[PDB]
Amino acid sequence: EKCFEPQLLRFFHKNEIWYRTEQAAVARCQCKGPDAHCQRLASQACRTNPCLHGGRCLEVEGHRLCHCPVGYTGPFCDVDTAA
Ligand SMILES: [Cl-]
Ligand SMILES: [Ho]
Ligand SMILES: [Ho]
Questions:
Q1: Where do the Fibronectin type-I domain residues begin and end?
Q2: Least packed by Cβ within 10 Å: which of 45, 46, 48, 59?
Q3: Which domain holds residue 36?
Q4: CA of 80 to the centre of ligand 2 (A)
């Protein structure tokens, strides 16, 4: 059985690992199937914020992530959705 990550709109296979953002923190999750085991990680703010529409930039393990506001999603919150 697979795990669904709604923030990415994608399923993950067992043991697969991905990132899931909160407003002020990043969580890394592993699929156990169908439930994911997550661990909240301490994240620093990116020096440069490439996120659009008020996206919060969270940097962890090198690369940057965008926690998008409602009505926006994608790698840089450049997709209009639920607003
Ligand atoms: Cl499936
Ligand atoms: Ho929208
Ligand atoms: Ho809209």
A1: 1-41
A2: 48
A3: 1-83
A4: 5
Resolution reading in Å? 2.5
Q: Which two tokens stand for residue 23?
A: 């407003």
Q: Are strands 17-21 and 10-12 parallel, antiparallel or unpaired?
A: unpaired
Residues forming a β-bridge with 17: 30
Cα of 5 to ligand 2 centre, how many Å? Answer: 21
**Ligand 1 centre distance from Cα of residue 54 (Å):** 33
Q: How far is the CA of 1 from the centre of ligand 1 (A)?
A: 7
Domain count, the chain: 1
Experimental approach: X-ray
Find, among 54, 47, 45, 48, the residue nearest to 77 by Cα.
Answer: 54
